[PDB]
Design a protein around this ligand. Structure first.
Ligand SMILES: [Mg+2]
Ligand SMILES: [Mg+2]
Ligand SMILES: [Mg+2]
Ligand SMILES: [Mg+2]
Ligand SMILES: [Mg+2]
Ligand SMILES: [Mg+2]
Ligand SMILES: [Mg+2]
Ligand SMILES: [Mg+2]
Ligand SMILES: [Mg+2]
Ligand SMILES: [Mg+2]
Lengths: 151, 114, 206, 96, 98, 127, 79
RNA sequence: CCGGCCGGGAACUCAAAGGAGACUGCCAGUGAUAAACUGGAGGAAGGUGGGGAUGACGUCAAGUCAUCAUGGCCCUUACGACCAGGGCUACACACGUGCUACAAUGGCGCAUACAAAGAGAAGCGACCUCGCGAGAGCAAGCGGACCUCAUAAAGUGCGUCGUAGUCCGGAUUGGAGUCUGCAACUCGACUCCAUGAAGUCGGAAUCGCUAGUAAUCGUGGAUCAGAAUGCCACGGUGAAUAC
């Protein structure tokens, strides 16, 4: 990205619900390239969220997710000697690229017995925005807006 | 549920439990639940004392626990007595089997200090 | 010290191979050495026979041996003698029997190895290294050569501190694989050290 | 690389087939379920250099005992010194 | 009834003793189940390039070995005189039996 | 006549034969399931019948060797759209748009001396 | 621990031990053969086992049997 | 004999020789009507398609007199040569590179699908039989798209384990062996039975990689009697991210 600007590879809208969104989710959660066993845990955790919320599938993900999405974020900036934390209103496409990055990240750092379990409770805490990841939204806003000044 | 050793184990699947003994390690275990003829994934619940003492006799067959320790130590003391290489090394607190000492001996050398 | 051998990288294309034979491991071994032994003995013999390149081929239980020289009648001797005393011991060395073929070297000033060898032969006669290189170069542009270059190396003349000094005249694309390039090599064993010659001769393309 | 060390290696191949391979085969069967008159092994009192595993494997031209290849019987150094003059049939810098 | 295995390191060549053998058959007696290509085995010798040190340098040479099959079905005593005494090609390896 | 399409992808190569009939699928003499219908991408072997219909209209007995679970299911996938050949080239346009027509030329890249594996570079420190 | 089918010992050492037994033990007994498996027929004797600079005296005993001579003649002096 | 297995079949898979194909050339946007870029078309492949080979003149008296060669130097009944045994494997430590982990995206048992690329006669070694096993005896085919190494592992099934220094992790050590080789004490590699350290994710600091890549999973090979967590090759599954 010095000069060679780029687009964004696109992935294969999810083998069950037909969404690209969840297809990035699985990947995010995927590890050592185990797609075979990746969605396995994502569907089962979307299954515990399924009826443990009733609300359904599609829409229960959409909300829980809706919370851990950030609107703004700071961005380093080494100028006259100092690093200068500069706020910048962040784009939609990433606005949840994180939200998912955090939601996944939040569940591994957790006590539940299994990944389906862990992941489930994160979505659910996030449903009522009171989980680890939602806090990462909070502390991200709280980081910018302190740099409210710079703009 | 005592058996063989001072040890008083049990409360999960069998084959696993038996490993508790200092002298049985999975194979000697499988072999005993088979030589005494008992289910191998069963807890002690349902497991009658009547069965437990049949096993107790099976393990009685090998040098487990206390005796094993002593016999195993006698083996090491014999070494040292003979003033051989494999013993000169036991006394000097370093790897017996040739492993390098120039680095990474640690396990057989105790946490490094000065 | 970071150029690919010019001959080597060509082989696949435009450049031949000075051993064509086939063998299957078990004998590939003994074979390779047999070769070294013939190119060894023959070079020390045909030293002053301006020999430019000696090819070898074993066809089933035979060894042929071809000899590119620029003085055929010296290699051959009196109506066929020298060829014998050679052939003889050449077939003796390789064990299996041997013919021998004397290829004539047309316009030797174009044969790299024969150029180097002269530059070498001269430095040991004790001649101005600069002069020799320049002579060599010309006689080649003279006879066509769409390019050439020779460089020597170290204790050039005497210098306790060693040099190289090249001399490119014409064209010499050591990157173009089509390019016919004849590259070879000769060292001179002087009284003050060992000077190494590399000659490139650019002959065309396709 | 040091005549003497070369020479050593030649006498090694020499004896390697005088006794061993030949006379030493009397140990393969002489030590198999044929039971015992223990003279059987004892007989390993022969030249020492007479065993084949005692042969190093040296560059056929220079004697270098490292970087050797059974195909060409040469050190990687000489392999390439010849490779780039054809010298080795069918052998060329390759890619893929 | 008689197949001749064929191998040499150079390809712009092996299929020339091939199409010579095959030709020096059909014209004569004849038959020949066409010349078959067959897996060319390729040895790969990769060695350190520096006289000393620099394990990251190295040359990567190879040796392609090419095969050709032949297979002649009608052994005409004439075609036998055609394989024999009409042949050569120093760098090629021929195998008459199997 | 047997109306055929090859198709192949990374190390695998599948041959897809077509013949109007049912909604049954043979591969290496297997049920769509008994080979990998019940693993990652059963849905993709069928896939090449989306904007082009079947549900039980046309038949397909195939084979395939080389590569793996998803290479073999990619190879076949190619061969189907390739066999839809015969049934005109009207349908072989939204098969472009589908992407199914292309040959996924992504190969395993070599392990190249000096590295650990193609790209992977030996970690280094200066001192 | 190796050997499996026919324990090993050098001939010169073995017949250096009958040059003692039937004859009575002489002074210490020199062999460089640190490979040889120690035998019962050696108990009570002393074998001088080379280690680099000299031969270390070793009184064979009712349990140095299976082991080698080299096992009782340290080769690396570390103080 | 439900075994491409036998007739055949020359279609297909492949095999290896020879061919065409991609040029910013086509529409268009941008840009000075230019170069170029960008988007679209068709196309297996669009913008040097993917990768490799190829490393200019030169910089570091950079590395190599131990691969070899060689000027000078020095030893020469010793600085040379031969033999045994030892040593290069030492061990308060420090640093570099790596391998194995701390575990349920996992361990375990049983069932079970799908590779690629190499290797080989002083070789690869089937089959059978013995041995829990490593291995062993006997013995076929194979100079090899035929035969052998050779049952890929991740994966998917069931089941079990239920967050514990654990059914995680396997160091260390004891005991008993197996094979190579005159020879496994120093110091070989494997195996069976016990043994079950540290380790619950790693301070300051720091590295790799932009796509079939990283990450992970197995496979072969050169050296080699024997001795790979190294090295060189191979395909399996398969990301994230670039304002
Ligand atoms: Mg350490
Ligand atoms: Mg010398
Ligand atoms: Mg050796
Ligand atoms: Mg890979
Ligand atoms: Mg310098
Ligand atoms: Mg230096
Ligand atoms: Mg000299
Ligand atoms: Mg050393
Ligand atoms: Mg375990
Ligand atoms: Mg971990």
């Amino acid at each position: 990205p010095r000069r060679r600007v780029i687009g964004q590879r696109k992935i294969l809208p999810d083998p069950k619900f037909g969404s690209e969104l969840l297809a990035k989710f699985v990947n995010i959660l995927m590890v050592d390239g185990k797609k075979s066993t990746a969605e396995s845990i994502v569907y089962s955790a979307l299954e515990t969220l399924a009826q443990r919320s009733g609300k359904s599938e599609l829409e229960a993900f959409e909300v829980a997710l809706e919370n851990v999405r950030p609107t703004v974020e700071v961005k380093s900036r080494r100028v006259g000697g100092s690093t200068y934390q500069v706020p910048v209103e962040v784009r939609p496409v990433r606005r949840n690229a994180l939200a998912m990055r955090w939601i996944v990240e939040a569940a591994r750092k957790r006590g539940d017995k299994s990944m389906a379990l862990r992941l489930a409770n994160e979505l659910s805490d996030a449903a009522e925005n009171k989980g680890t990841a939602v806090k990462k939204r909070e502390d991200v806003h709280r980081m910018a807006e302190a740099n409210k000044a710079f703009a | 549920a005592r058996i063989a050793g001072i040890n008083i184990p049990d409360h999960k699947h069998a084959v696993i439990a038996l490993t508790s003994i200092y002298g049985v390690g999975k194979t000697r275990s499988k072999a005993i639940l088979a030589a005494a003829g008992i289910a191998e994934d069963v807890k002690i619940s349902e497991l009658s004392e009547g069965q437990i003492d049949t096993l107790r006799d099976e393990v009685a067959k090998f040098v487990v626990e206390g005796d094993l320790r002593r016999e195993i130590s006698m083996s090491i003391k014999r070494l040292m007595d003979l003033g051989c290489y494999r013993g000169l090394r036991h006394r000097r607190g370093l790897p017996v089997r040739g492993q390098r000492t120039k680095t990474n001996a640690r396990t057989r050398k105790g946490p490094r200090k000065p | 010290g970071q150029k690919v051998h010019p001959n080597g990288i060509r082989l696949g294309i435009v450049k031949p191979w000075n051993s064509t034979w086939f063998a299957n491991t078990k004998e590939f071994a003994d074979n390779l050495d047999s070769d070294f032994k013939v190119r060894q003995y023959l070079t020390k013999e045909l030293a002053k026979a301006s020999v430019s390149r000696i090819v070898i081929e074993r066809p089933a239980k035979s060894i042929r041996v071809t000899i590119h020289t620029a003085r055929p009648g010296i290699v051959i001797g009196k109506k066929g003698e020298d060829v014998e005393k050679l052939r003889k011991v050449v077939a003796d060395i390789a064990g299996v029997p041997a013919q021998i073929n004397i290829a004539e070297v047309r316009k030797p000033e174009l044969d790299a190895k024969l150029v180097a060898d002269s530059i070498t032969s001269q430095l040991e006669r004790r001649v101005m290294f600069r002069r020799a290189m320049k002579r060599a170069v010309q006689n080649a542009m003279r006879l066509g050569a769409k390019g050439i270059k020779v460089e020597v190396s170290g204790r050039l003349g005497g210098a306790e501190i060693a040099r190289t000094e090249w001399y490119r005249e014409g064209r010499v694309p050591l990157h173009t694989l089509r390019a016919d390039i004849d590259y070879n090599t000769s060292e001179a064993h002087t009284t003050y050290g060992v000077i190494g010659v590399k000659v490139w001769i650019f002959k065309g393309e396709i | 690389a040091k005549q003497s060390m070369k020479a050593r290696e030649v006498k090694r191949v020499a004896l390697a087939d005088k006794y061993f391979a030949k006379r030493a085969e009397l140990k393969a069967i002489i030590s198999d379920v044929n039971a015992r008159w223990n003279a059987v092994l004892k007989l390993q009192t022969l030249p020492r250099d007479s065993s084949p595993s005692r042969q190093r494997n040296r560059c056929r031209q220079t004697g270098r005992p490292h970087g050797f290849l059974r195909k060409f019987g040469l050190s990687r150094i000489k392999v390439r010194e010849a490779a780039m003059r054809g010298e080795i049939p069918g052998l060329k810098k390759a890619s893929w | 009834r008689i197949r001749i295995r064929l191998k040499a390191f150079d390809h712009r060549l092996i299929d020339q003793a091939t199409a010579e053998i095959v030709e020096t058959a059909k014209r004569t007696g004849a038959q020949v189940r066409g010349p078959i290509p067959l897996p060319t085995r390729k040895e790969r010798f990769t060695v350190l390039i520096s006289p000393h040190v620099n394990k990251d340098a190295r040359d990567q040479y190879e040796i392609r070995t090419h095969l050709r099959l032949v297979d002649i079905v009608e052994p005409t005593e004439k075609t036998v005189d055609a394989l024999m005494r009409l042949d050569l090609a120093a760098g090629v390896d021929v195998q008459i039996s199997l | 006549n047997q109306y055929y399409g090859t198709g192949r992808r990374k190390s695998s190569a599948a041959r897809v034969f077509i013949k109007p009939g049912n909604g049954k699928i043979v591969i290496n003499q297997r049920s769509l399931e008994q080979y990998f219908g019940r693993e990652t991408a059963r849905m993709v072997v069928r896939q090449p019948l989306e904007l082009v219909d079947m549900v039980e209209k046309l038949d397909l007995y195939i084979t395939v060797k080389g590569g793996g679970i998803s290479g073999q299911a990619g190879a076949i996938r190619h061969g189907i759209t390739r066999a839809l050949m015969e049934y005109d080239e009207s349908l072989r346009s939204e098969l472009r748009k589908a992407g199914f027509v292309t040959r996924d030329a992504r190969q395993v890249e070599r392990k190249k001396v000096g590295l650990r594996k193609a790209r992977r570079r030996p970690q280094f420190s200066k001192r | 621990r190796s050997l499996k089918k026919g324990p090993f010992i050098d001939l010169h050492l073995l017949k250096k031990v009958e040059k003692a037994v039937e004859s009575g033990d002489k002074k210490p007994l020199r062999t460089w053969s640190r490979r040889s498996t120690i035998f019962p027929n050696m108990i009570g004797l002393t074998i001088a086992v080379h280690n680099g600079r000299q031969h270390v005296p070793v009184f064979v005993t009712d349990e140095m049997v299976g082991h080698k001579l080299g096992e009782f003649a340290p080769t690396r002096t570390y103080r």
